[PDB]
Design a protein around this ligand. Structure first.
Ligand SMILES: CC(C)C[C@H](NC(=O)OCc1ccccc1)C(=O)N[C@@H](C)C(=O)NO
Ligand SMILES: [Ca+2]
Ligand SMILES: [Ca+2]
Ligand SMILES: [Ca+2]
Ligand SMILES: [Ca+2]
Ligand SMILES: [Ca+2]
Ligand SMILES: [Ca+2]
Ligand SMILES: [Ca+2]
Ligand SMILES: [Zn+2]
Length: 470
């Protein structure tokens, strides 16, 4: 039994977590739990244990003196270059997009909440090629001085010097800012302190697939970013930062397009070519939105449910949707895709290739596009009379309608069965073809009611002998 439903079922159970689950011999935490563990120090710019309140912060790029020594003892200091400043500002904005944080730049001489500076020596006249960067959480006091907000980077590392071309560099900026806002790593470990490895994590999801605060490879949980690094807060980072400063309800409230043809104005949410891969966790506060992954040629798996992961552009588990966000439409690429909608009305387009489309609840509009496509249904409510799904480009003898879930569940080959007239018997399915309108009605009486409780409208003719999977 290799059906469209199996592919759907697989994607729906991808990366399940929490509720007493255990992965890699470790406890699994839900998105909510992870967000809380990541902010376990309880420090915020609004005060200790003061959660959910908005904050206004200033930042700057001070003019550090080479010969000066910073609080951690590093020296060979320097001001961020123009390329570093530009990428740092993109990293700041990516945090402000998801939580109620306002960032305002002040002059180098003015006191600032968050600062950025380069270092190159661990002792005078001795270059350091072994460290990467560090930062102090809010309310870190030493000798009556508040160190919170300072972020320091080893400019001897090429990724730090050229964050615009080395994605690890941009990720490092986002990570350090995360610390400066109050987030810790998801587990108790820190560079220059023992020999930690993924085996030392507290919860399974402590990887770069779920949080950029993590040190561990996404491959530990089955992800694969193809050698790239996420530039902006990931799924669990969003939960963490929103716990501290609240969710930003004014972000992208209009109709937004993510991926190709994007109108987000965010480098990490957009792409203009098959070679440019995206890695992101989507936060969107309103509107009719679309995941457009039409320009990719790889086989993709797109799930529009909240907190779920998708396989986009040749990568694995690189795209996700934050808790409480509703993304309405999705467009597949020229590969053989699996596209799973949600309870809202979705517009799903498979594009070329042999796709599997699952609308779920609501009134969906499904387009298989070219290729041999399969439209899957598993509940009467997937296409209730009054709110029917529409299959707009069905090709008889080529595409298929998969109703296999039903007989499997009933464990009976005769539950779903075609008839020429209803009788009130549950399981009866009826096809009504209108040659003048080019529309075929597929009615099914799943519950055994007086009237059918499932009705799909199909543009095109359907051949009962070859077009169904039952
Ligand atoms: C919350 C703590 C762990 C922050 C620590 N100071 C630090 O920046 N450590 C370095 C090694 C680091 O993790 N930078 O990202
Ligand atoms: Ca939107
Ligand atoms: Ca929406
Ligand atoms: Ca496709
Ligand atoms: Ca197709
Ligand atoms: Ca539906
Ligand atoms: Ca739907
Ligand atoms: Ca097709
Ligand atoms: Zn860190």
């Amino acid at each position: 039994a290799t059906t469209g439903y199996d592919a759907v079922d697989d994607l729906l159970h991808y990366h399940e977590r929490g509720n007493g689950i255990q992965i890699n011999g470790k406890d699994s935490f839900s998105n909510e739990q992870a967000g809380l563990f990541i902010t376990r120090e309880n420090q915020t710019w609004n005060g200790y244990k003061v959660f959910g309140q908005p904050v206004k912060l200033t930042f700057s790029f001070p003019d550090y003196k080479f010969s000066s020594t910073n609080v951690a003892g590093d020296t060979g200091l320097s001001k961020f270059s123009a390329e570093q400043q530009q990428q740092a500002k993109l990293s700041l904005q990516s945090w402000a997009d998801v939580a109620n944080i306002t960032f305002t730049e002040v002059a180098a001489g003015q006191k600032a909440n968050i600062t950025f500076g380069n270092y190159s020596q661990d002792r005078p006249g001795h270059y350091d090629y072994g460290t990467q960067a560090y930062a102090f959480l809010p309310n870190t006091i030493w000798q009556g001085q508040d160190l919170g907000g300072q972020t320091w980077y080893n400019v001897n590392q090429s990724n730090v010097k050229h964050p615009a071309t080395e994605d690890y560099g941009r990720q490092t900026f986002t990570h350090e800012i995360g610390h400066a806002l109050g987030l810790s790593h998801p587990g108790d470990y820190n560079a220059g302190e023992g020999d930690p490895t993924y085996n030392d994590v507290t919860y399974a999801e402590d990887t770069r697939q779920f949080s950029l605060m993590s040190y561990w490879s996404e491959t530990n949980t089955g992800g694969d970013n193809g050698g790239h690094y996420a530039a902006a807060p990931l799924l669990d980072d969003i939960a963490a930062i929103q716990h501290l400063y609240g969710a930003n309800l004014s972000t992208r409230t209009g109709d937004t397009v993510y991926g190709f043809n994007s109108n987000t104005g965010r480098d990490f949410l957009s792409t203009t070519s098959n070679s440019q891969k995206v890695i992101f966790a989507a936060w969107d506060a309103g509107g009719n939105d679309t995941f457009d992954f039409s320009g990719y040629t790889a086989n993709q798996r797109i799930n529009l449910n909240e907190k779920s992961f998708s396989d986009v552009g040749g990568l694995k588990g690189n795209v996700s949707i934050a808790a409480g966000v509703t993304i309405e439409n999705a467009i597949g690429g020229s590969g053989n895709d699996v596209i799973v909608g949600n309870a809202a009305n979705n517009v799903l387009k498979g594009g070329a290739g042999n796709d599997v489309l699952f609308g779920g609840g609501g009134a969906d509009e499904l387009w298989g596009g070219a290729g041999k496509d399969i439209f899957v249904f598993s509940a009467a409510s997937d296409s209730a009379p009054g709110a029917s799904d529409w299959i707009r480009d069905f090709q008889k003898g080529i595409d298929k309608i998969d109703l296999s879930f039903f007989d499997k569940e009933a464990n009976s080959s005769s539950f779903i069965h075609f008839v020429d007239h209803f009788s009130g018997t549950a399981g009866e399915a009826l096809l009504s073809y209108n040659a003048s309108s080019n529309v075929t009605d597929l009615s099914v009486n799943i519950g055994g009611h007086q009237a059918p409780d499932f009705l799909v409208k199909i543009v095109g003719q359907v051949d009962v002998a070859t077009d169904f999977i039952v």
